[PDB]
């Protein structure tokens, strides 16, 4: 019974450390990017007025 209890504790600890590591690595990755079809241009003349 004590062996089963400590095995459950070890399993809980390893799954918890896996979860915290996964959350940590996810929390820093560059998930989304902004692609630029046309970058900002440098105007030569004035469009307005």
């Amino acid at each position: 019974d004590l062996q089963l209890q400590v095995g459950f504790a070890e399993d809980a600890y390893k799954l918890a450390l896996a979860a915290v590591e996964s959350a940590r690595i996810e929390a820093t990755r560059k998930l989304k990017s902004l692609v630029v079809v046309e970058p900002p241009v440098l105007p030569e003349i004035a469009e307005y007025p």
Partner: peptide
Amino acid sequence: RLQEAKRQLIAFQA
């Protein structure tokens, strides 16, 4: 929880 379980196991070994 793991610390408490290990403490119980090492206490009941004797």
